[PDB]
Amino acid sequence: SKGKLGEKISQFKIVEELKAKGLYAYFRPIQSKQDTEVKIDGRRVLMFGSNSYLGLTTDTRIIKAAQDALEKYGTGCAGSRFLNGTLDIHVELEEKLSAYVGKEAAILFSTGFQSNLGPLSCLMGRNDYILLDERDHASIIDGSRLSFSKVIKYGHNNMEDLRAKLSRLPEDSAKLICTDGIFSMEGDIVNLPELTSIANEFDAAVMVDDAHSLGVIGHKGAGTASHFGLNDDVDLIMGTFSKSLASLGGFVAGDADVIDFLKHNARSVMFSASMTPASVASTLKALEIIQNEPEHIEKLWKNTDYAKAQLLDHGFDLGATESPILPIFIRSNEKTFWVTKMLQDDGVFVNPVVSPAVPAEESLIRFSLMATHTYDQIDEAIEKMVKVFKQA
Amino acid sequence: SKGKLGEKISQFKIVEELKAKGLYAYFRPIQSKQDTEVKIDGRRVLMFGSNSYLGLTTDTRIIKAAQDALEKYGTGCAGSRFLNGTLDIHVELEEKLSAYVGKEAAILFSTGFQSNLGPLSCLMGRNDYILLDERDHASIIDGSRLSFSKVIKYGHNNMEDLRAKLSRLPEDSAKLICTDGIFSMEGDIVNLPELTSIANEFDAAVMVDDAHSLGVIGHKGAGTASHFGLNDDVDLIMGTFSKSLASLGGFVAGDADVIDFLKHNARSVMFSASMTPASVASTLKALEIIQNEPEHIEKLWKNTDYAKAQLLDHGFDLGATESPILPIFIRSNEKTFWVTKMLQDDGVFVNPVVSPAVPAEESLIRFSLMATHTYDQIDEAIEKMVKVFKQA
Structure with a gap:
């Protein structure tokens, strides 16, 4: 029935006026x-x-590998990674990415969006807290909203506000700080050095979203942690394949025990079809190119x-x-x-x-x-x- | 810092024991x-x-169209549909799908998972309500959790519990009932006839997730509404391309004004890279085949x-x-x-x-x-x- 539904969307006229003008x-x-x-x-x-x-989406070699993948594996895996959707190439990409960002293990997601949804929704529980930079990408806000923890936003790149809000939280409770590496709106970089100093001072987990950092900053494009040389102080490095890597999908890299927990508890990977063979080969070839050229x-x-x-x-x-x-x-x-x-x-x-x-x-x-x-x-x-x- | 984080995952040992055994x-x-x-x-x-x-993922024709798409459009669109990620083929798929399920318009999402996240997160607001079948797919629970409305679960295929919970809600407030068409766990079908009768009695919007219905039930695989001939009583028909359609991605079909609202308000489509050209061509070819053969x-x-x-x-x-x-x-x-x-x-x-x-x-x-x-x-x-x- 469209009665009450019609009322909820009736107020939205900006697109209507934009088109008319x-x-x-x-x-x-x-x-x-x-x-x-x-x-x-x-x-x-x-x-x-x-x-x-x-500008790699047009690279004939990346296009070729994708076409070869389709020839060998077909158009899709028809299932989540959890069940029937895992291919040897998914596993290969995970280990290649792990070596790239300097972490033990990695888990792919169908999209970069779902890559944030996973860790943010299942790591911090009921009496825990998630600290977000007020300008974090929407997928990060949503992922945190999917958790059952208390989400606290802090001033953009404001370390004093971060430390201040962290210090008010109970000793016995977990905290997770999540931030964009390079923020998409103004194109600025997170103050990782000070954020991590504050983090390991309060024993808070750190997650960085490198959607716009991979293939841009860091040694050979390895990201923000690589850029600041703080690999050891970043618990989770998240990235996307939809930008520099010219594909579709994402990943979260970290310690073997944490990723293994993610693999079996994050709904966005357990209940969503795996990335197509074409995109996996596409990402693998692009990664190789970013490093070797x-x-x-x-x-x-x-x-x-x-x-x-x-x-x-x-x-x-x-x-x-x-x-x-x-x-x-x-x-x-x-x-x-x-x-x-x-x-x-x-x-x-x-x-x-x-x-x-x-x-x-x-x-x-x-x-x-x-x-x-x-x-x-x-x-x-x-x-x-x-x-x-x-x-x- | 891994201190408190280590404690949160330390309790999860089922995978550890499963492997050891x-x-x-x-x-x-x-x-x-x-x-x-x-x-x-x-x-x-x-x-x-x-x-x-x-079993279409191996169809040489679907594989060919995907390979052709890659040859013409590259490995990805490098942006959300909102901005630079729209291709003529995305638009073509949307109109073909619209005609398929018998609706005015449609909007694609990168995954079926994000297809539920969109409408469930932005249609029902603060003083509204979302009614979910207790066995709804995880993406539906999460999507509803992303909204700012009150989420109410009702007994599985229990119409008395649906009507009962709906009748307790204030007259002046919107309601949205969301259900799987065919439920993935037990493989049963939603009692659409009675659900819709209850819906248009209370003026509640109806959304059906046809992930497992498309290409299975309904005239030429058109879905659950088609199966019951209740097309006119279902406000939103959602589907996925990761199952019968042998690809990756999803969509939500409905009235032009509602879909246009979705297109510009659902975060999962506004802030996530569009589906790869390979998957769009793949879905288009599969759709054609499902109908014509x-x-x-x-x-x-x-x-x-x-x-x-x-x-x-x-x-x-x-x-x-x-x-x-x-x-x-x-x-x-x-x-x-x-x-x-x-x-x-x-x-x-x-x-x-x-x-x-x-x-x-x-x-x-x-x-x-x-x-x-x-x-x-x-x-x-x-x-x-x-x-x-x-x-x-």
Whole structure:
């Protein structure tokens, strides 16, 4: 019955107004492979709103391995890892990833989202606590909400607030601090050194979500712990295969006893079909490439440095970023939407960040770099962004 | 820090004891494609613990389309559907699925698990209520837990308890009843006719999870609503691509205004990378095949009927199943594990259902049929099950 249901959604009219005004730019139908340039409605558009940091989704070798996987293993495993969904290649990926981040064991999940849901939902129980950075990814908030523990949020990268909130908690109770390595919104890095110091001072477990760190920071792209050399102080390293690794899925690495507990207690892995053979081979090949070919990470950072400088010279107000995620502040929801659509019309694809995700004064567009980007593409994009910002 | 964390997992020793006793049979490493027969440790094993009801994961045509998708679109979209992750093929699948289940629109999710998380987390708010069948899939319990509404569980397929709990709720408040179409544990079907009668009597929204119904029941495999002809009384039809559809991912179909609300409010679709091109093409091809080739669904039911009869003649106590999921009761956790391992050693793969998922007296092994199974394979499996049940 749709009576009361109709009332609950009747209030949501932002999409309706966005479309009517001709400003709507969500769910854009791309007709070609994710690349530095994508075809939308038959026309070419520069892609600066991607998470494919190393531009590997088009690598013919990664594509080949995926196609080979399908030829040997089929289109899917038709079951969770727990039961009939485990393949030797899943196990191989887990050990390769374990060696990569320098941990004993690892467990894959169908998506990066479910990778956070698992550990956050079953490690901390009834009289325990989960400490979250207020800007943590949504999957982290949800995962913590799935637990039966008390979830406490602390100021963004505010160590004083972290220590303060931790010190109020009872001695006899477990605590788990969970943080993004590189935060997706402003592209900044977590203060791991101080967070871990506070953590092992109160004996709290530490989990880091490296969705945007893998293949970006750390030795050979190994992540945030690797970046700070704090591997030994991070209990759980979580990552995703949907960004630098050009695939779909995720993982959680840590000590053998903890991962074994995860494997058999996390609902997101026990009750969800395993990742497709194509994605496993895809992730394996990409991982190999990220390590054995330093040109990619190097290329990514050359584009990031070049674009960041180019943007600052044009007067743009960039956020406190320390990654390939360049947040260009706009400070107006309407203007942010307008800029996005106008750039889209001018062949430039950027991601908008608006309310209710952030207050109107903190609204911005996310400009993201890929290793495969060229100085020309960057110049063309920025050149058009100046023009559009002028018009607004 | 691992201090308090070590204490929380120290109590979990069932896996440890299972392995030491040589009874462990979880996460078995399959070395070949999911099929009626799978290679484990170099040896062949009959597969009766799969969700690939139509045995389509090995279909060369579905494999080909996936490989073609990869060739054209690459290994991944590197972003959520919300932003840069939408492809024309995603949109095509959504409209094809919409036509399939007879609904206006549809929105895909990266996994079937996240397909439940979306609608259950954002439709019913603060002063609203979600009614769940006590045996609903874990993803449904979690999705409801993600909402800010009051979650109320009712007796399994108990309509009196449903009506009773619904009647206690305030007039001015929304309600959403969510149920599995075909329940995975005992393989039974929800009493949709009476549930919907109670629903539109109290003006409650109805959502059905057809993970195990699609490609099994309903005209041409269209599902539970189709099965009962109650399409018009089901507000939301949710499904998965990881079982009959031989892939990975899921969807929620319904009215255009509701789905549009989902698209822009469900965190599991807004903050999670879209399904890989390979899986989208894979799902599209499988869907086409399920409809245009009735031999599969027919074959599945011939095997189900044959196996069910064969099992009842041998004296096995089957559950109240009405699907290809044949639950063979054992009523002993230890015996259930022992039977599973012994069958595994004898080349027969079955799934165990034990505590704490169900009380020890309700423990059983799930025997599942695939359209591609042969009468010989079924005979061989059952023949070995009789022997093993004897030994126990």
